[PDB]
Write a protein that binds this ligand. Structure first.
Ligand SMILES: Nc1ncnc2c1ncn2[C@H]1C[C@H](O)[C@@H](COP(=O)(O)OP(=O)(O)OP(=O)(O)O)O1
Ligand SMILES: [Ca+2]
Ligand SMILES: [Mg+2]
Length: 430
DNA sequence: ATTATGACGCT
DNA sequence: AGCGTCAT
Protein backbone atom coordinates (compact mmCIF):
# COMPACT_ATOMS: atom_id res chain seq x y z
CA UNK A 1 0.00 0.00 0.00
CA UNK A 2 1.29 3.42 1.11
CA UNK A 3 4.84 2.06 1.62
CA UNK A 4 5.30 -0.10 -1.51
CA UNK A 5 7.89 1.45 -3.81
CA UNK A 6 6.75 1.73 -7.43
CA UNK A 7 10.02 2.70 -9.13
CA UNK A 8 8.48 5.88 -10.53
CA UNK A 9 11.10 8.32 -9.20
CA UNK A 10 13.08 8.85 -12.44
CA UNK A 11 12.52 9.53 -16.12
CA UNK A 12 14.93 7.45 -18.23
CA UNK A 13 15.20 7.22 -22.00
CA UNK A 14 17.09 4.87 -24.26
CA UNK A 15 18.03 6.28 -27.67
CA UNK A 16 18.94 3.80 -30.40
CA UNK A 17 20.16 4.95 -33.80
CA UNK A 18 18.29 3.09 -36.52
CA UNK A 19 20.49 0.66 -38.50
CA UNK A 20 23.36 2.95 -37.56
CA UNK A 21 26.24 1.86 -39.81
CA UNK A 22 23.84 1.78 -42.77
CA UNK A 23 22.71 5.35 -42.05
CA UNK A 24 26.36 6.47 -41.81
CA UNK A 25 27.00 5.02 -45.29
CA UNK A 26 23.72 6.43 -46.69
CA UNK A 27 24.58 9.91 -45.44
CA UNK A 28 27.93 9.65 -47.22
CA UNK A 29 26.54 8.08 -50.43
CA UNK A 30 23.08 9.45 -51.29
CA UNK A 31 22.60 6.70 -53.90
CA UNK A 32 22.05 4.30 -50.97
CA UNK A 33 19.32 6.39 -49.35
CA UNK A 34 15.80 4.88 -49.13
CA UNK A 35 16.93 1.57 -50.62
CA UNK A 36 17.48 -1.99 -49.42
CA UNK A 37 21.07 -1.83 -48.36
CA UNK A 38 23.42 -3.40 -45.88
CA UNK A 39 26.90 -2.89 -44.45
CA UNK A 40 29.35 -5.76 -44.95
CA UNK A 41 32.85 -6.44 -43.73
CA UNK A 42 35.33 -8.19 -46.03
CA UNK A 43 34.17 -9.63 -49.38
CA UNK A 44 36.17 -12.73 -50.34
CA UNK A 45 34.34 -15.33 -48.22
CA UNK A 46 30.73 -15.68 -49.40
CA UNK A 47 30.57 -12.00 -50.31
CA UNK A 48 31.34 -10.73 -46.82
CA UNK A 49 29.50 -10.85 -43.51
CA UNK A 50 26.55 -8.48 -43.09
CA UNK A 51 26.66 -6.40 -39.90
CA UNK A 52 23.86 -3.82 -40.42
CA UNK A 53 20.67 -3.79 -42.49
CA UNK A 54 18.33 -1.04 -43.64
CA UNK A 55 14.66 -1.49 -42.81
CA UNK A 56 13.85 -1.77 -46.53
CA UNK A 57 16.28 -4.69 -46.76
CA UNK A 58 14.94 -6.26 -43.56
CA UNK A 59 11.58 -6.47 -45.33
CA UNK A 60 13.20 -9.03 -47.66
CA UNK A 61 14.53 -11.09 -44.75
CA UNK A 62 18.08 -9.74 -44.76
CA UNK A 63 19.59 -9.90 -41.26
CA UNK A 64 22.96 -9.41 -39.59
CA UNK A 65 25.23 -12.47 -39.32
CA UNK A 66 24.19 -13.31 -42.89
CA UNK A 67 26.64 -13.83 -45.73
CA UNK A 68 26.20 -11.17 -48.41
CA UNK A 69 25.88 -13.88 -51.07
CA UNK A 70 22.91 -15.32 -49.16
CA UNK A 71 21.30 -11.95 -48.55
CA UNK A 72 21.54 -11.35 -52.31
CA UNK A 73 19.55 -14.54 -52.72
CA UNK A 74 16.78 -12.97 -50.64
CA UNK A 75 17.14 -9.44 -52.04
CA UNK A 76 18.80 -9.43 -55.48
CA UNK A 77 18.79 -5.63 -55.66
CA UNK A 78 20.39 -5.27 -52.22
CA UNK A 79 22.98 -2.52 -52.16
CA UNK A 80 26.09 -2.97 -50.05
CA UNK A 81 28.62 -0.69 -48.42
CA UNK A 82 31.88 -2.18 -47.19
CA UNK A 83 33.60 -1.39 -43.93
CA UNK A 84 36.96 0.28 -44.54
CA UNK A 85 39.99 -2.01 -44.33
CA UNK A 86 43.27 -0.73 -42.89
CA UNK A 87 46.39 -2.69 -41.96
CA UNK A 88 44.63 -5.82 -43.22
CA UNK A 89 41.63 -5.60 -40.87
CA UNK A 90 38.24 -3.96 -40.62
CA UNK A 91 38.49 -0.40 -39.34
CA UNK A 92 35.44 1.11 -37.65
CA UNK A 93 36.73 4.69 -37.28
CA UNK A 94 34.01 6.27 -39.48
CA UNK A 95 31.25 4.86 -37.28
CA UNK A 96 32.98 5.77 -34.00
CA UNK A 97 33.30 9.38 -35.20
CA UNK A 98 29.65 9.49 -36.29
CA UNK A 99 28.72 8.08 -32.88
CA UNK A 100 30.60 10.93 -31.22
CA UNK A 101 28.52 13.36 -33.32
CA UNK A 102 25.31 11.95 -31.91
CA UNK A 103 26.54 11.50 -28.33
CA UNK A 104 27.69 15.13 -28.19
CA UNK A 105 24.27 16.38 -29.34
CA UNK A 106 22.49 14.19 -26.76
CA UNK A 107 24.78 15.51 -24.02
CA UNK A 108 23.39 19.02 -24.57
CA UNK A 109 20.01 17.87 -23.23
CA UNK A 110 20.91 15.62 -20.30
CA UNK A 111 23.47 13.27 -18.79
CA UNK A 112 24.04 10.23 -21.00
CA UNK A 113 25.49 6.75 -20.48
CA UNK A 114 27.06 5.46 -23.68
CA UNK A 115 25.65 1.95 -23.86
CA UNK A 116 27.03 1.04 -27.28
CA UNK A 117 28.37 2.75 -30.42
CA UNK A 118 24.81 3.59 -31.40
CA UNK A 119 22.93 3.48 -28.09
CA UNK A 120 22.75 5.78 -25.09
CA UNK A 121 20.69 5.99 -21.93
CA UNK A 122 19.49 9.42 -20.86
CA UNK A 123 18.56 10.46 -17.34
CA UNK A 124 15.81 13.06 -17.92
CA UNK A 125 14.55 13.50 -14.33
CA UNK A 126 16.04 16.97 -13.79
CA UNK A 127 15.33 18.21 -17.32
CA UNK A 128 11.70 17.13 -16.83
CA UNK A 129 11.44 19.07 -13.57
CA UNK A 130 12.77 22.18 -15.33
CA UNK A 131 10.43 21.81 -18.31
CA UNK A 132 7.45 21.31 -15.99
CA UNK A 133 8.45 24.51 -14.21
CA UNK A 134 8.45 26.34 -17.56
CA UNK A 135 5.13 24.83 -18.70
CA UNK A 136 3.31 26.28 -15.64
CA UNK A 137 0.20 24.09 -15.64
CA UNK A 138 -0.15 24.38 -19.42
CA UNK A 139 -1.51 21.21 -21.07
CA UNK A 140 0.65 19.20 -23.43
CA UNK A 141 -0.44 19.33 -27.04
CA UNK A 142 -0.36 16.23 -29.22
CA UNK A 143 1.67 18.37 -31.65
CA UNK A 144 4.56 18.19 -29.21
CA UNK A 145 4.60 14.37 -29.55
CA UNK A 146 4.44 13.78 -33.33
CA UNK A 147 6.30 10.44 -33.28
CA UNK A 148 5.32 9.09 -29.85
CA UNK A 149 3.45 5.83 -29.22
CA UNK A 150 1.80 5.21 -25.85
CA UNK A 151 2.21 1.49 -25.17
CA UNK A 152 -1.09 -0.18 -24.33
CA UNK A 153 -3.27 2.44 -26.03
CA UNK A 154 -5.67 2.89 -27.67
CA UNK A 155 -7.94 0.58 -25.73
CA UNK A 156 -11.63 0.21 -25.08
CA UNK A 157 -14.73 1.39 -27.02
CA UNK A 158 -9.21 3.79 -38.30
CA UNK A 159 -7.20 1.02 -39.94
CA UNK A 160 -3.96 2.97 -40.51
CA UNK A 161 -0.80 2.86 -38.40
CA UNK A 162 -0.56 6.61 -37.78
CA UNK A 163 -4.29 6.69 -37.00
CA UNK A 164 -3.82 4.14 -34.21
CA UNK A 165 -0.80 6.07 -32.91
CA UNK A 166 -2.82 9.28 -32.71
CA UNK A 167 -5.83 7.56 -31.12
CA UNK A 168 -3.66 6.15 -28.34
CA UNK A 169 -1.89 9.48 -27.86
CA UNK A 170 -5.22 11.32 -27.66
CA UNK A 171 -6.53 8.92 -25.02
CA UNK A 172 -3.34 9.34 -22.98
CA UNK A 173 -3.33 13.15 -23.14
CA UNK A 174 -7.08 13.29 -22.49
CA UNK A 175 -6.61 11.41 -19.25
CA UNK A 176 -3.64 13.57 -18.22
CA UNK A 177 -5.57 16.79 -18.87
CA UNK A 178 -8.56 15.46 -16.88
CA UNK A 179 -6.22 14.42 -14.00
CA UNK A 180 -6.99 10.69 -14.27
CA UNK A 181 -3.28 9.80 -14.43
CA UNK A 182 -0.45 10.20 -11.93
CA UNK A 183 2.37 12.69 -11.52
CA UNK A 184 4.85 10.04 -12.76
CA UNK A 185 2.72 9.77 -15.93
CA UNK A 186 3.04 13.51 -16.48
CA UNK A 187 6.78 13.32 -15.82
CA UNK A 188 7.10 10.57 -18.45
CA UNK A 189 5.03 12.65 -20.89
CA UNK A 190 7.32 15.66 -20.49
CA UNK A 191 10.24 13.27 -20.84
CA UNK A 192 8.79 12.21 -24.20
CA UNK A 193 8.47 15.86 -25.27
CA UNK A 194 12.15 16.34 -24.50
CA UNK A 195 13.06 13.15 -26.38
CA UNK A 196 11.13 14.37 -29.42
CA UNK A 197 13.24 17.53 -29.24
CA UNK A 198 16.47 15.54 -28.78
CA UNK A 199 15.67 13.28 -31.73
CA UNK A 200 14.78 16.26 -33.93
CA UNK A 201 18.09 17.90 -33.02
CA UNK A 202 20.02 14.70 -33.82
CA UNK A 203 18.34 14.38 -37.21
CA UNK A 204 18.71 18.09 -38.05
CA UNK A 205 22.37 18.24 -37.08
CA UNK A 206 23.56 14.82 -38.31
CA UNK A 207 20.99 13.48 -40.74
CA UNK A 208 20.58 10.39 -38.56
CA UNK A 209 17.22 9.05 -37.37
CA UNK A 210 16.74 7.05 -34.22
CA UNK A 211 14.12 5.39 -32.11
CA UNK A 212 13.70 5.88 -28.39
CA UNK A 213 11.98 4.45 -25.37
CA UNK A 214 10.90 6.60 -22.43
CA UNK A 215 10.05 5.01 -19.06
CA UNK A 216 11.06 5.02 -15.38
CA UNK A 217 14.21 2.90 -15.63
CA UNK A 218 16.77 1.61 -18.11
CA UNK A 219 15.29 -1.86 -18.71
CA UNK A 220 11.82 -0.54 -19.46
CA UNK A 221 13.25 2.27 -21.61
CA UNK A 222 15.30 -0.25 -23.61
CA UNK A 223 12.27 -2.52 -24.04
CA UNK A 224 10.05 0.46 -25.01
CA UNK A 225 12.53 1.61 -27.66
CA UNK A 226 12.17 -1.63 -29.63
CA UNK A 227 8.36 -1.57 -29.67
CA UNK A 228 7.99 0.94 -32.55
CA UNK A 229 10.95 1.07 -34.92
CA UNK A 230 12.24 2.80 -36.94
CA UNK A 231 12.14 6.56 -36.42
CA UNK A 232 9.52 6.45 -33.60
CA UNK A 233 9.53 6.62 -29.81
CA UNK A 234 7.48 4.72 -27.26
CA UNK A 235 6.38 5.68 -23.74
CA UNK A 236 6.00 2.73 -21.38
CA UNK A 237 4.23 3.87 -18.27
CA UNK A 238 4.27 2.09 -14.94
CA UNK A 239 0.59 1.22 -15.40
CA UNK A 240 1.28 -0.38 -18.77
CA UNK A 241 3.64 -2.95 -17.23
CA UNK A 242 1.16 -5.71 -16.18
CA UNK A 243 -0.42 -6.05 -19.62
CA UNK A 244 2.88 -5.59 -21.48
CA UNK A 245 4.64 -8.19 -19.37
CA UNK A 246 1.73 -10.66 -19.46
CA UNK A 247 2.74 -11.89 -22.94
CA UNK A 248 6.36 -10.73 -23.01
CA UNK A 249 8.81 -13.62 -23.49
CA UNK A 250 11.41 -13.49 -20.72
CA UNK A 251 14.25 -13.41 -23.26
CA UNK A 252 13.14 -9.97 -24.48
CA UNK A 253 14.26 -8.25 -21.25
CA UNK A 254 17.85 -7.01 -21.28
CA UNK A 255 20.21 -9.48 -19.52
CA UNK A 256 17.70 -12.35 -19.82
CA UNK A 257 18.39 -13.17 -23.48
CA UNK A 258 20.95 -15.85 -22.62
CA UNK A 259 21.64 -18.67 -20.15
CA UNK A 260 20.07 -16.98 -17.10
CA UNK A 261 16.77 -16.34 -18.90
CA UNK A 262 16.76 -19.91 -20.18
CA UNK A 263 17.26 -21.16 -16.63
CA UNK A 264 14.47 -18.90 -15.35
CA UNK A 265 12.16 -20.46 -17.96
CA UNK A 266 13.30 -24.02 -17.25
CA UNK A 267 13.45 -23.97 -13.46
CA UNK A 268 10.23 -22.06 -12.92
CA UNK A 269 8.32 -23.52 -15.87
CA UNK A 270 7.13 -20.12 -17.10
CA UNK A 271 7.31 -18.25 -20.42
CA UNK A 272 6.44 -14.58 -19.82
CA UNK A 273 7.97 -11.87 -17.67
CA UNK A 274 4.66 -11.28 -15.83
CA UNK A 275 4.53 -14.84 -14.55
CA UNK A 276 7.50 -14.00 -12.34
CA UNK A 277 5.29 -11.98 -10.01
CA UNK A 278 3.94 -15.18 -8.47
CA UNK A 279 7.24 -16.03 -6.74
CA UNK A 280 8.57 -14.57 -3.53
CA UNK A 281 11.82 -12.68 -3.50
CA UNK A 282 13.39 -15.45 -1.43
CA UNK A 283 12.26 -18.06 -3.98
CA UNK A 284 13.89 -16.19 -6.83
CA UNK A 285 17.06 -15.64 -4.81
CA UNK A 286 17.20 -19.36 -3.96
CA UNK A 287 17.19 -20.26 -7.62
CA UNK A 288 19.20 -17.42 -9.20
CA UNK A 289 21.33 -15.92 -6.41
CA UNK A 290 20.81 -12.97 -4.09
CA UNK A 291 21.43 -10.23 -6.67
CA UNK A 292 19.63 -11.82 -9.62
CA UNK A 293 16.71 -12.86 -7.42
CA UNK A 294 16.16 -9.37 -5.99
CA UNK A 295 16.56 -7.89 -9.47
CA UNK A 296 14.01 -10.26 -11.00
CA UNK A 297 11.55 -9.72 -8.16
CA UNK A 298 11.58 -5.97 -8.73
CA UNK A 299 11.94 -6.09 -12.53
CA UNK A 300 8.86 -8.23 -13.17
CA UNK A 301 6.90 -5.48 -11.40
CA UNK A 302 8.46 -2.80 -13.62
CA UNK A 303 11.00 -1.68 -11.00
CA UNK A 304 14.74 -1.38 -11.55
CA UNK A 305 17.26 0.87 -9.81
CA UNK A 306 20.35 0.70 -12.03
CA UNK A 307 21.51 4.31 -12.51
CA UNK A 308 22.19 6.03 -15.77
CA UNK A 309 25.91 6.33 -15.36
CA UNK A 310 27.52 9.63 -16.38
CA UNK A 311 29.85 8.16 -18.99
CA UNK A 312 29.90 9.44 -22.57
CA UNK A 313 33.20 7.81 -23.54
CA UNK A 314 34.09 4.10 -23.84
CA UNK A 315 36.08 2.66 -20.92
CA UNK A 316 38.31 0.55 -23.17
CA UNK A 317 39.83 0.86 -26.62
CA UNK A 318 40.32 -2.46 -28.36
CA UNK A 319 41.42 -4.00 -31.64
CA UNK A 320 40.53 -7.58 -32.58
CA UNK A 321 40.74 -9.93 -35.55
CA UNK A 322 39.52 -13.47 -36.07
CA UNK A 323 41.51 -15.82 -38.28
CA UNK A 324 38.87 -18.43 -39.08
CA UNK A 325 39.29 -21.87 -40.56
CA UNK A 326 42.19 -22.18 -42.96
CA UNK A 327 43.49 -18.64 -42.23
CA UNK A 328 44.50 -19.51 -38.64
CA UNK A 329 47.97 -18.21 -37.78
CA UNK A 330 50.50 -21.08 -37.79
CA UNK A 331 53.92 -19.33 -37.79
CA UNK A 332 55.63 -17.00 -35.33
CA UNK A 333 56.22 -14.46 -38.09
CA UNK A 334 52.48 -14.44 -38.80
CA UNK A 335 51.54 -13.93 -35.14
CA UNK A 336 54.04 -11.10 -34.74
CA UNK A 337 53.02 -9.33 -37.96
CA UNK A 338 49.35 -9.36 -37.00
CA UNK A 339 50.09 -8.28 -33.43
CA UNK A 340 51.93 -5.36 -35.02
CA UNK A 341 48.98 -4.50 -37.27
CA UNK A 342 46.60 -4.53 -34.30
CA UNK A 343 49.05 -2.54 -32.19
CA UNK A 344 49.47 0.11 -34.91
CA UNK A 345 45.73 0.64 -35.13
CA UNK A 346 45.56 0.71 -31.32
CA UNK A 347 48.40 3.26 -31.09
CA UNK A 348 46.60 5.50 -33.59
CA UNK A 349 43.31 5.33 -31.72
CA UNK A 350 45.02 5.81 -28.33
CA UNK A 351 46.93 8.90 -29.45
CA UNK A 352 43.71 10.39 -30.77
CA UNK A 353 41.91 9.47 -27.54
CA UNK A 354 44.62 11.11 -25.42
CA UNK A 355 44.44 14.33 -27.43
CA UNK A 356 40.61 14.49 -27.42
CA UNK A 357 39.76 13.25 -23.94
CA UNK A 358 42.70 14.11 -21.62
CA UNK A 359 43.37 10.57 -20.46
CA UNK A 360 45.93 7.79 -20.91
CA UNK A 361 45.48 4.04 -20.78
CA UNK A 362 47.71 2.20 -18.34
CA UNK A 363 46.94 -1.50 -18.91
CA UNK A 364 47.24 -3.59 -22.08
CA UNK A 365 45.10 -6.73 -22.23
CA UNK A 366 46.07 -9.43 -24.73
CA UNK A 367 43.59 -12.14 -25.61
CA UNK A 368 43.88 -15.06 -28.01
CA UNK A 369 41.81 -18.00 -29.22
CA UNK A 370 43.35 -21.35 -30.16
CA UNK A 371 41.91 -23.51 -32.91
CA UNK A 372 39.45 -26.04 -31.48
CA UNK A 373 38.48 -24.05 -28.39
CA UNK A 374 34.75 -23.27 -28.44
CA UNK A 375 35.14 -20.20 -26.21
CA UNK A 376 35.57 -16.79 -27.82
CA UNK A 377 38.73 -16.29 -25.76
CA UNK A 378 41.12 -19.08 -24.87
CA UNK A 379 43.56 -17.00 -22.89
CA UNK A 380 43.84 -13.47 -21.53
CA UNK A 381 46.95 -11.87 -20.04
CA UNK A 382 47.65 -8.30 -18.95
CA UNK A 383 50.82 -6.24 -18.97
CA UNK A 384 51.64 -2.63 -18.23
CA UNK A 385 50.86 -0.12 -20.97
CA UNK A 386 53.50 2.57 -20.38
CA UNK A 387 54.13 4.09 -23.85
CA UNK A 388 51.83 4.67 -26.85
CA UNK A 389 54.19 2.79 -29.15
CA UNK A 390 52.92 0.06 -31.46
CA UNK A 391 56.20 -1.88 -31.60
CA UNK A 392 56.47 -1.95 -27.82
CA UNK A 393 52.85 -2.97 -27.38
CA UNK A 394 53.14 -5.75 -29.97
CA UNK A 395 56.42 -7.01 -28.50
CA UNK A 396 54.89 -7.01 -25.01
CA UNK A 397 51.80 -8.87 -26.24
CA UNK A 398 54.04 -11.46 -27.86
CA UNK A 399 55.98 -11.80 -24.62
CA UNK A 400 52.83 -12.43 -22.60
CA UNK A 401 51.45 -15.04 -25.05
CA UNK A 402 54.59 -16.76 -26.42
CA UNK A 403 54.45 -19.55 -23.85
CA UNK A 404 51.13 -20.72 -25.30
CA UNK A 405 52.87 -22.15 -28.37
CA UNK A 406 53.13 -25.91 -27.76
CA UNK A 407 55.19 -26.51 -30.94
CA UNK A 408 58.71 -27.79 -30.40
CA UNK A 409 59.82 -25.80 -33.45
CA UNK A 410 60.36 -22.18 -32.41
CA UNK A 411 59.37 -20.93 -35.89
CA UNK A 412 56.05 -22.81 -35.91
CA UNK A 413 53.01 -21.91 -33.83
CA UNK A 414 50.64 -24.57 -32.60
CA UNK A 415 47.91 -24.84 -32.00
CA UNK A 416 47.17 -22.21 -34.70
CA UNK A 417 45.65 -18.96 -33.47
CA UNK A 418 42.11 -18.11 -34.56
CA UNK A 419 41.81 -14.70 -32.84
CA UNK A 420 44.08 -11.89 -31.62
CA UNK A 421 42.82 -9.09 -29.40
CA UNK A 422 44.62 -6.11 -27.86
CA UNK A 423 42.70 -3.89 -25.46
CA UNK A 424 43.83 -0.74 -23.68
CA UNK A 425 42.16 -0.30 -20.30
CA UNK A 426 42.54 1.42 -16.90
CA UNK A 427 42.50 5.04 -18.08
CA UNK A 428 43.86 7.84 -15.88
CA UNK A 429 43.44 11.57 -16.34
CA UNK A 430 46.24 13.26 -18.28
C1' DA B 1 33.78 -19.03 -41.44
C1' DT B 2 27.75 -15.28 -37.15
C1' DT B 3 33.20 -10.21 -36.90
C1' DA B 4 34.61 -6.42 -34.05
C1' DT B 5 33.85 -4.65 -30.77
C1' DG B 6 32.16 -3.06 -25.56
C1' DA B 7 30.32 -3.49 -20.46
C1' DC B 8 30.15 -5.96 -16.44
C1' DG B 9 29.91 -10.11 -13.03
C1' DC B 10 32.31 -14.02 -10.47
C1' DT B 11 35.85 -15.83 -7.72
C1' DA C 1 44.01 -11.31 -11.82
C1' DG C 2 41.74 -14.30 -15.43
C1' DC C 3 37.41 -16.22 -16.92
C1' DG C 4 32.49 -16.02 -18.15
C1' DT C 5 28.09 -13.75 -19.71
C1' DC C 6 25.44 -10.60 -22.38
C1' DA C 7 24.75 -7.37 -25.95
C1' DT C 8 25.52 -4.32 -29.97
N1 LIG D 1 26.99 -8.21 -33.97
C1 LIG D 1 27.50 -7.10 -34.51
N2 LIG D 1 28.67 -7.09 -35.09
C2 LIG D 1 29.17 -5.98 -35.63
N3 LIG D 1 28.58 -4.82 -35.63
C3 LIG D 1 27.38 -4.79 -35.05
C4 LIG D 1 26.79 -5.92 -34.46
N4 LIG D 1 25.60 -5.58 -33.96
C5 LIG D 1 25.44 -4.31 -34.22
N5 LIG D 1 26.50 -3.79 -34.87
C6 LIG D 1 26.76 -2.43 -35.35
C7 LIG D 1 26.14 -2.15 -36.65
C8 LIG D 1 24.90 -1.38 -36.25
O1 LIG D 1 24.67 -0.37 -37.21
C9 LIG D 1 25.29 -0.75 -34.92
C10 LIG D 1 24.11 -0.78 -33.97
O2 LIG D 1 23.68 -2.06 -33.63
P1 LIG D 1 22.15 -2.41 -33.39
O3 LIG D 1 21.54 -1.38 -32.47
O4 LIG D 1 21.97 -3.81 -32.87
O5 LIG D 1 21.41 -2.43 -34.73
P2 LIG D 1 21.11 -1.34 -35.78
O6 LIG D 1 21.46 0.05 -35.28
O7 LIG D 1 21.98 -1.65 -36.96
O8 LIG D 1 19.57 -1.46 -36.11
P3 LIG D 1 18.33 -1.08 -35.24
O9 LIG D 1 17.67 0.15 -35.77
O10 LIG D 1 17.26 -2.15 -35.18
O11 LIG D 1 18.90 -0.84 -33.89
O12 LIG D 1 26.39 -1.49 -34.35
CA1 LIG E 1 20.45 0.79 -33.56
MG1 LIG F 1 21.69 -0.01 -30.79
Amino acid sequence: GPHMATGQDRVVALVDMDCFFVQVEQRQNPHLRNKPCAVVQYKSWKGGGIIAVSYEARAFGVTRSMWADDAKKLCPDLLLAQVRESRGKANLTKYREASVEVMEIMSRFAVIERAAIDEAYVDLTSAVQERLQKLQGQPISADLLPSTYIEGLPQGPTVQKEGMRKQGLFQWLDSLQIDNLTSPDLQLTVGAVIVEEMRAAIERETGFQCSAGISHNKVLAKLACGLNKPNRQTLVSHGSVPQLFSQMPIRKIRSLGGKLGASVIEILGIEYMGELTQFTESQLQSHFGEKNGSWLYAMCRGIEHDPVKPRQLPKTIGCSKNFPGKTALATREQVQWWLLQLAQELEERLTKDRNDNDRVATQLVVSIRVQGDKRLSSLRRCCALTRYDAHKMSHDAFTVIKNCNTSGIQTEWSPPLTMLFLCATKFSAS
